[PDB]
């Protein structure tokens, strides 16, 4: 399928502030339609996939 980024993987070795900032960036980037979001169950992993207002590398986007 399409490229997909795991928020929980992105947050390895982060502190609370950095982890919260990555979680918030998913909300902002979803609002900007740069990504699409999927979460299966409460507190499961959150997966970002491409949205129609960003066509670059998601891996680079979240570096």
């Amino acid at each position: 399928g399409a490229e997909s980024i795991s928020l929980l993987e992105l947050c390895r070795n982060t502190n609370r502030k950095q982890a919260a900032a990555k979680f918030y960036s998913f909300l902002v980037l979803k609002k900007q339609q740069a990504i699409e979001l999927t979460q299966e169950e409460p507190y499961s992993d959150i997966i970002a996939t491409p949205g129609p207002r960003f066509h670059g590398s998601l891996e680079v986007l979240f570096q």
Binding site: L7, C11, T14, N15, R16, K17, Q18, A19, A20, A21, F23, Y24, F26, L27, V28, K30, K31, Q33, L37, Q39, P42, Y43, I46
Partner: protein
């Protein structure tokens, strides 16, 4: 006493059936500018029995998703709350919009509003007093109140202010059979006692609250009536010993210390008839880097023992102290659509 989980279907921007939470002892609702966060607060007011006229809509059906623009998603919508109490099984309180009427349910048993609110009141949830809710601007509002404005606030919350009519009416009969005096002292004692039943509890608690908010034993805070014999007739004095400062009134406190003292008063007043959970809508708006972390850690400390904290916050220095984040984001659609993500902050150091 714990709001465990909220379930929503087609309520304002929360289109479709959504699970909100589970909530932890300290949960922060966050997200970029949009309608969704404030719609979630209205969902909580709604499921706890709030009147339509207090939800800034003209009709009950206007709460159904899309009904504002003449395209309601369904003829029904609902909010439900799973409430947990130590030693008891979970109970689900649900309010369903069915056409133009509400339908109230406790564990899928249909009840009238009177019984619904009676059961919530037995839990400490008071929809008339909104004890479970701190609105936007409540800190800034309480910081601006003068001694006499605090007294009227205490007259309201204590239901002594509803004795104000019979009070001076029996005084009228007494100014003019030296027995209307005892009828006046009778109603005087009742107004005094209702006043002090509430006020003495608030005054007792405020010092420890101010201490914990300041994170300093050196701080202290004093509430007392200008008129000890008839407190309701005059103002309520509020004096603090701010950390490293002189004993000063509140209305003379430094801009940042002042908000901390207003916060202590706000919390002390809610300590009178506390709810088991506290929805704080941007209670950190009036904070700055002087006091943001102190207040956040106070909420954090309080959340373990005294009340479940559900905060709506725009400031990371505040909400990164929560155990959980409920992130609200928008979907593109005909109308504003809100959806949520849940994030467990306890997995990360700091």
């Amino acid at each position: 006493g714990f709001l465990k989980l909220i379930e929503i279907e087609n309520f304002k921007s929360y289109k479709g059936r959504q699970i909100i939470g589970p909530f932890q002892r300290f949960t922060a609702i966050i997200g970029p500018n949009g309608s969704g966060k404030s719609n979630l607060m209205d969902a909580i007011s709604f499921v706890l029995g709030e009147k339509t006229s207090n939800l800034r809509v003209k009709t009950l059906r206007d709460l159904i998703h899309g009904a504002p623009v003449g395209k309601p998603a369904a003829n029904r919508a609902f909010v439900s709350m799973v409430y947990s109490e130590e030693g008891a099984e979970d109970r689900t309180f649900a309010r369903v919009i069915v056409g133009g009427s509400s339908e109230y349910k406790i564990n899928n048993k249909v009840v009238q509003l009177h019984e619904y609110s009676e059961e919530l009141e037995k839990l400490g949830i008071l929809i008339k007093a909104r004890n479970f809710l701190v609105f936007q601007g409540a800190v800034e509002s309480i910081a601006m109140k003068n001694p006499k404005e605090r007294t009227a606030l205490f007259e309201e919350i204590s239901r002594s202010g509803e004795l104000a009519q019979e009070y001076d009416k029996r005084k009228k009969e007494m100014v003019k059979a030296k027995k209307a005096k005892q009828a006046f002292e009778q109603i005087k004692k009742e107004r005094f006692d209702r006043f002090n039943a509430c006020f003495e509890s608030v005054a007792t608690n405020i010092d420890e609250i101010y201490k914990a908010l300041s994170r300093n034993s050196s701080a202290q805070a004093f509430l007392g009536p200008e008129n000890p014999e008839e407190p309701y007739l005059d103002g309520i004095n509020y004096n603090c010993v701010a950390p490293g400062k002189r004993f000063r009134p509140m209305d003379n406190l430094s801009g940042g210390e002042k908000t901390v003292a207003a916060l202590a008063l706000l919390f002390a007043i809610h300590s009178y008839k506390p709810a088991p959970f506290f929805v704080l809508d941007q209670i950190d708006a009036a904070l700055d880097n002087t006091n943001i972390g102190k207040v956040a850690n106070y909420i954090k400390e309080q959340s373990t023992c005294n009340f479940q904290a559900i905060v709506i916050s725009l400031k990371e220095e505040f909400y990164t102290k929560a155990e959980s984040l409920i992130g609200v984001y928008p979907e593109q659609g005909d109308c504003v659509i809100s959806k949520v993500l849940t994030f467990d902050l306890t997995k990360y150091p700091d």
